[PDB]
Design an enzyme around this catalytic site. Sequence first.
Site, mmCIF file in Angstrom:
data_model
loop_
_atom_site.group_PDB
_atom_site.id
_atom_site.type_symbol
_atom_site.label_atom_id
_atom_site.label_comp_id
_atom_site.label_asym_id
_atom_site.label_seq_id
_atom_site.Cartn_x
_atom_site.Cartn_y
_atom_site.Cartn_z
ATOM 1 N N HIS A 152 30.281 47.257 36.170
ATOM 2 C CA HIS A 152 29.847 48.586 36.558
ATOM 3 C C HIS A 152 31.233 49.582 36.327
ATOM 4 O O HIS A 152 31.016 50.631 36.427
ATOM 5 C CB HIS A 152 29.484 48.755 38.086
ATOM 6 C CG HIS A 152 30.409 48.401 39.094
ATOM 7 N ND1 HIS A 152 30.345 47.267 39.813
ATOM 8 C CD2 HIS A 152 31.449 49.112 39.662
ATOM 9 C CE1 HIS A 152 31.386 47.294 40.686
ATOM 10 N NE2 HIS A 152 31.938 48.413 40.638
ATOM 11 N N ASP A 156 27.381 41.562 36.814
ATOM 12 C CA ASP A 156 28.332 42.511 37.052
ATOM 13 C C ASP A 156 29.738 42.236 36.499
ATOM 14 O O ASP A 156 30.526 41.772 37.099
ATOM 15 C CB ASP A 156 28.437 42.791 38.395
ATOM 16 C CG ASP A 156 29.184 44.346 38.611
ATOM 17 O OD1 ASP A 156 29.668 44.682 37.793
ATOM 18 O OD2 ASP A 156 29.094 44.705 39.834
ATOM 19 N N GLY A 190 37.870 51.152 44.966
ATOM 20 C CA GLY A 190 39.201 50.956 44.201
ATOM 21 C C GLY A 190 39.211 49.397 43.949
ATOM 22 O O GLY A 190 39.932 48.954 43.022
ATOM 23 N N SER A 219 36.866 47.116 43.448
ATOM 24 C CA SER A 219 35.787 46.738 42.252
ATOM 25 C C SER A 219 36.513 46.016 41.152
ATOM 26 O O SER A 219 37.736 46.200 40.636
ATOM 27 C CB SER A 219 35.001 47.730 41.592
ATOM 28 O OG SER A 219 33.773 47.932 42.460
ATOM 29 N N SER A 275 31.898 42.795 43.231
ATOM 30 C CA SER A 275 31.130 43.953 42.927
ATOM 31 C C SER A 275 30.907 44.835 43.807
ATOM 32 O O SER A 275 30.878 45.966 43.482
ATOM 33 C CB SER A 275 29.891 42.803 42.429
ATOM 34 O OG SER A 275 28.836 43.960 42.098
#
Lengths: 51, 185
Positions: free
Chosen positions: B33, B63, B139, B141, B156
């Site tokens: 993402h 992801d 932040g 991720s 994720s």
Amino acid sequence: VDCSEYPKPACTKEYRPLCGSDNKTYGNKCNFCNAVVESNGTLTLSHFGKC
Amino acid sequence: ISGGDAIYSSTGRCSLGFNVRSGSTYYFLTAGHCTDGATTWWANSARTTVLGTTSGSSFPNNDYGIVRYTNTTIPKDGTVGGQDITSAANATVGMAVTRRGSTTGTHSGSVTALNATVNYGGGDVVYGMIRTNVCAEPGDSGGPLYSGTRAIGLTSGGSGNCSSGGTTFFQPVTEALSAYGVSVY
């Protein structure tokens, strides 16, 4: 930003900040919209970016 | 730069997952993402230190994404912060794990379930996720989930935060490694 499709049980964790009317910087739109829902619609968007 | 450090795209900030390589070609993994619709990645908010460009992205459904390093001089440590990573493994229920991200730093917890489905809405559904009781915030991720010197997953998303506690889901890193034919080092 439109929070009509909220709440959402999960949010991704990328950082693209929004500034809420509570002076809190929200990390992304998903976190912001879930907070709006949690406030029962009292919280609003102050501006885009960090507070 | 190492696992857990900040990475910036044209859109926002995520965290570097793990530094990996194939032959003499170096890349870094992060969340799909984050790579979705991103081309170039930088090491700083000023966008003055280039890292590389997106080579693959898989989100939703999975992801994970991969970025090919184009910066020749920046150190590419095979670590997570100071922590050496020497292999990758599959998560198991009850496993003690640790996450590192650019916003919250390092937090620990356990794997509570496997093969979870997370619906981010709008048709953004990801499958086969690792569920944990580790917190994460915007932040974080793409940051690494590891256990000792073993690479386990990539951050994720989920709910909650680090103050009140939460549930975070991770993409199994083994799947990304296989898809791209790369390995940790």
